[PDB]
Write a protein that binds this ligand. Structure first.
Ligand SMILES: Nc1ncnc2c1ncn2[C@@H]1O[C@H](COP(=O)(O)OP(=O)(O)O)[C@@H](O)[C@H]1O
Ligand SMILES: Nc1ncnc2c1ncn2[C@@H]1O[C@H](COP(=O)(O)OP(=O)(O)O)[C@@H](O)[C@H]1O
Ligand SMILES: NCCC[C@H](N)C(=O)O
Ligand SMILES: NCCC[C@H](N)C(=O)O
Ligand SMILES: [Cl-]
Ligand SMILES: [Cl-]
Ligand SMILES: [Cl-]
Ligand SMILES: [Cl-]
Ligand SMILES: [K+]
Ligand SMILES: [K+]
Ligand SMILES: [K+]
Ligand SMILES: [K+]
Ligand SMILES: [Mn+2]
Ligand SMILES: [Mn+2]
Lengths: 342, 342
């Protein structure tokens, strides 16, 4: 059971309720790299950029292969580090490495010296059966002997999205965090990231629509980038609702959402509006135990009412991009996918 | 000393800091009627309909001759009532009667069996020198004998607005009530109530602009009608800002102002805005000893920064109507005015 303490008081408050301590890498991109070491060389299976930032468990994060925003440059630094780690720790077969990118800096989060859960997706995505390869390495056949020595970068994007069991446990706050709660995953294949993401999103049973009213209620950190999300939604045809401070931020930028009351503020409030079906999209971000506790009503309603919702700004942007794609437009077989690989 | 108490709490509260008790006619139109009685008959000098509701002292209320909203049927009752009083009281000379109209019902405020401060305005409006006649009547010369027996109804609108000394006493809260504080008055003459109001407004040294951003912050009782007012403002090309509760009501009507913070909510706040000359108009209504003391900065700032502001919704509608008029478009002389009277 992890925790992200924000302040001193927070700390106590934690222990009370409650040991390692790690500085939390706020606003960093999380990445996973799957690889194979045969003692002689390292084979990079895949570099997957997560959509949800570090702090949202990698198992609960949607992710993309190839990276959708990371510079090749910083990806090179990761590949090198993966390499140094592989040789140093004497890996023989699969490994997984998790990093956090912040301010153009690579930070190591952990090393899993075995097959990680990302293995099948990377394999489907790249056409290389890494578990068969790594198993051959284990039994003694080298990467070189098997002919699997060069990293494969596919010509299309593969996006992985997860499914959470929150609807099975209503009393739980359907919020993402450092601890993994998802039961499964799906894969979206597209020409662009928007396209992959849209397939991934639909595949994951998302109720997201291409029109309607969107409710925006974001935390302080999010106040800046929210403006841009709000316009993208505007550009797409949605109308907007916003709670107090979010409305303020949007107002100051020129966006004037319809103001909506928090449960405490009066009626009608969000709960009522959600209950009524006024929304087709909800973007709600939060930060701080207490802040989280209050906003619980939103997610709870959103889930109960089947309204698609994002709890991270990164996810919101990803959702916004997919609005530009059409998941039903084109289909492709795995055989065809793999045949496109040069 | 008069004040309106709203609840049990409030009443002691008063008595504390502090005798007749009278029920307060809320959301009522105040009316003034000047009249002459000689024992034989009653001449109606004029029926004036206040812009500001009962609760804002007549003396500080803007007014209209002829009535701009009241039905003929209701004036008829007041006319009826006045006569009854005159004879009843044995009025010989001038008299004044104040009424309040609630739900199509006429309530009697007071009777002043003497010359009222409205006499000169009525005289000027109607061409009938009420003071001369009444004196004559007082000395023994009947209306009949004077040949002043019919109620004159002007072909033009006559609006009286007042001037308040707030600017000379900064420490004071520039807000209207049951006690009179104005020192003078002005008159506006027009083809329409709007044109008349517009002249009276300009006459009163108002800083009202025909463009800019308006700030709307209104009470509960007003939250409903404010929509129409907001619409007018928008139709006129103003941009709107609203405090929370007001913003909620508008938005719920399709009207999304720019949300703004009270002083206690954040920076920038209203005071700041005002201070920055961000507004050209402010509509601020309040109810309650506290809601009032809490809004004080709005009015003080507004007065101090020379921004035109109205403290009644009625006053705000009038201001709006006047936006459709040109005070400097047409001029007329008292002589012509009177010449127009048949
Ligand atoms: N220092 C950190 N800064 C930001 N996020 C972190 C940090 N440490 C861990 N996390 C978050 O916690 C998650 C799980 O931590 P990790 O060490 O990988 O635990 P696990 O063994 O459960 O897989 C990560 O996937 C990440 O999103
Ligand atoms: N019962 C009432 N309901 C509403 N407003 C009232 C009532 N009584 C007085 N007022 C308001 O207070 C003002 C002053 O009361 P009034 O008896 O006329 O006082 P004054 O002697 O100063 O002229 C009125 O002009 C009116 O707007
Ligand atoms: N990849 C996690 C699922 C995202 C979920 N809609 C949310 O953002 O909370
Ligand atoms: N006739 C009263 C003065 C009007 C002023 N703008 C107010 O509404 O406070
Ligand atoms: Cl794993
Ligand atoms: Cl449950
Ligand atoms: Cl008087
Ligand atoms: Cl003073
Ligand atoms: K993550
Ligand atoms: K692990
Ligand atoms: K009045
Ligand atoms: K009096
Ligand atoms: Mn991990
Ligand atoms: Mn009076």
């Amino acid at each position: 059971a992890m925790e992200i303490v924000y302040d001193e008081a927070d700390l106590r408050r934690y222990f009370q309720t409650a040991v390692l301590l790690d500085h939390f890498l706020d606003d960093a991109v999380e990445v996973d790299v799957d690889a194979i070491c045969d003692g002689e060389m390292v084979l990079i299976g895949g570099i997957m950029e997560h959509i949800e930032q570090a702090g949202v468990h990698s198992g609960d994060s949607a992710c993309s292969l190839p990276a959708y925003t990371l510079s090749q440059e910083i990806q090179d630094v990761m590949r090198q580090q993966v390499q140094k780690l592989a040789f140093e720790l004497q890996v023989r077969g699969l490994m997984n490495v998790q990093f956090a990118v912040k301010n153009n800096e690579v930070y190591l989060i952990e090393v899993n010296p075995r097959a990680a859960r990302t293995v099948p997706f990377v394999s489907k995505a790249t056409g290389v059966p890494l578990a068969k390869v790594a198993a051959r390495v284990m039994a003694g056949k080298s990467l070189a002997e098997q002919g699997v020595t060069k990293e494969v970068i596919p010509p299309y994007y593969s996006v992985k999205e997860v499914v959470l069991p929150f609807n099975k446990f209503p009393g739980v706050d359907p919020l993402l965090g450092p601890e993994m709660r998802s039961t499964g995953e799906v894969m979206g294949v597209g020409r662009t990231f928007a396209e992959a993401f849209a397939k991934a999103q639909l595949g994951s049973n998302s109720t997201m629509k291409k029109h309607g009213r969107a409710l925006l209620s974001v935390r302080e950190g999010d106040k800046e980038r929210v403006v841009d999300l709000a316009a993208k939604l505007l550009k797409q045809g949605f109308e907007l609702d916003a709670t107090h401070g979010t409305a303020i931020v949007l107002g100051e930028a020129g966006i004037n959402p319809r103001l909506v009351n928090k449960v405490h503020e009066g009626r009608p409030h969000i709960q009522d509006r959600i209950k009524n079906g006024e929304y087709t999209y909800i973007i709600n971000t939060t930060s701080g135990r207490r802040a989280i506790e209050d906003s619980r009503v939103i997610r709870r309603s959103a889930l109960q009412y089947k309204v698609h919702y994002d709890t991270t700004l990164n996810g919101g942007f990803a959702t916004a991009m997919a609005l530009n794609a059409d998941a039903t437009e084109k289909v492709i077989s795995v055989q065809e996918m793999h045949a496109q690989i040069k």
